């Protein structure tokens, strides 16, 4: 329809304020075309013209389905903007009007209502919880209450998954516990669907739900999703691997029993690839995940050893992006803090000393503290074998003693005390 292309806001207002439903329809279509242009769509000019209450009333026009669709699309693009722009849509009374449109017999209208509510919920915790209080979850889940997800239109299913992921998103506060329990069986079902975009957004939803206290993690782990998350951890698509690794990383911040479920599902077999992944963010999050597994029980540290992951940790400590190296330093300090003497001895035999010492040259106070604590734990294990001199020589040979010597004359209190202590105790 070339007749509704490049209208001015003034003309859109004239059409919408006419007492003619057809003129209102043409002007609403003209508004959605303005609001869907790639170059700076005039969202604030449409808001200032007072058009949001008119679009919201058009949502209720059951007799005119095209004006319901055009106004839903126009409002979706306004709600997609800034928090102030989403607020203007919510202030117009759009939330219950969009929820009423979820049960529409027109699939393209229903989908637009799903999209709009995803944008509103996606703004933050308060609008997410307001969408929930207006009762969006029951009609949203009803749209997915089919025997096989493959019968639904692809774009439609992707929009439903994405909107459900925004209802799972954000913290302070986290989503209501009862809302999470209501959504989780549909989420577990979407996590087994064959579409890469549905899988990515399902993983993102699971990653938000596992980002919190152990009670929140427990809700997810009890649904038996960990084996599916580990399978997706092995996917070829980076948009699937990224949220799958984030969810797994979040679960291992939980209890040692919750971490054990990740190990039992076969997650450690994927870490040789994840710890050498060419995408730095995958390497960083894989090493962060490793740090929270090495912070566990001695039998869990043993499974890290058995899977041949200690040479991979030496590798990341030797060469990686600094942020990944900082996570590796944490993984080593956690391993040395909770491991057996035999496990700590193994770490030295894998060559941890030289890369650990080279990272003392870093201009980061926290990594220096983490490495010095790891050295203390390594010496503590060497004290139990009477091999402190053998370790002292190894540290001296790679130029590690010269780096600890300079750390005695360091600005930070913790660095000064730990380095001075190591030299007067072992050098």
């Amino acid at each position: 329809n070339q007749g509704t292309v490049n209208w001015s806001v003034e003309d859109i207002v004239k059409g919408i304020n006419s007492n003619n439903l057809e003129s209102q329809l043409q002007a609403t279509q003209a508004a959605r075309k303005l609001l869907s242009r790639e170059k700076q769509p005039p969202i604030d000019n449409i808001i200032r013209a007072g058009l949001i209450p008119k679009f919201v009333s058009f949502l209720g026009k059951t007799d005119c389905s095209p004006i319901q669709f055009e106004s839903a699309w126009a409002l979706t693009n306004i709600a997609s903007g800034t928090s102030e722009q989403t607020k203007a849509v919510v202030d117009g009374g759009a939330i219950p009007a969009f929820i009423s449109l979820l049960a529409s017999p027109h699939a393209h209208i229903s989908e637009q209502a799903v999209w709009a509510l995803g944008n509103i919920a996606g703004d933050g915790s308060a609008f997410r919880d307001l969408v929930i209080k207006h009762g969006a979850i029951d009609p949203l889940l009803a749209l997915l209450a089919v025997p096989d997800l493959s019968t639904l239109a692809c774009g439609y299913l992707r929009n439903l998954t994405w909107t459900l992921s925004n209802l799972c998103r954000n913290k302070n506060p986290a989503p209501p516990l009862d809302a999470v329990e209501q959504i989780l069986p549909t989420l577990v079902r979407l996590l087994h669907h064959n579409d890469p975009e549905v899988l990515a957004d399902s993983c993102w939803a699971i990653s938000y739900l596992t980002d919190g206290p152990n009670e929140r993690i427990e809700m997810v782990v009890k649904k038996g999703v960990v084996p599916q998350l580990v399978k997706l951890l092995g996917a070829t698509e980076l948009p699937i691997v990224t949220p799958a690794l984030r969810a797994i990383g979040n679960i291992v911040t939980g209890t040692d029993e919750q971490t054990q479920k990740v190990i039992d599902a076969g997650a450690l077999a994927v870490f040789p690839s994840l710890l050498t992944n060419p995408k730095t963010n995958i390497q960083k999050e894989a090493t962060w995940t490793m740090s929270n597994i090495t912070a566990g029980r001695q039998d869990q540290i043993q499974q890290v050893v058995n899977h041949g992951l200690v040479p991979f940790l030496v590798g990341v400590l030797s060469k990686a992006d600094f942020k990944t190296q900082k996570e590796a330093a944490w993984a080593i300090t956690n391993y040395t803090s909770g491991g057996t003497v035999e496990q700590i001895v193994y770490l030295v035999h894998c060559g941890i000393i030289e890369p650990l010492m080279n990272l003392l040259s870093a201009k980061d106070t926290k990594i220096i503290q983490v490495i010095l604590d790891a050295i203390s734990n390594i010496f503590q294990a060497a004290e139990k074998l009477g091999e402190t001199e053998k370790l002292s020589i190894m540290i001296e040979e790679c130029g590690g003693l010269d780096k600890i010597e300079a750390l005695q004359r360091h600005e930070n209190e913790s660095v000064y005390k730990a380095s001075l202590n190591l030299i007067e105790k072992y050098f």
């Binding site: 869907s36 979706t76 903007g81 989403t86 637009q112 999209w115 944008n119 996606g122 993102w204």
Partner: peptide, 6 residues
């Protein structure tokens, strides 16, 4: 990934 326009 937050909000999306159509």
């Amino acid at each position: 990934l937050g909000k999306r326009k159509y």
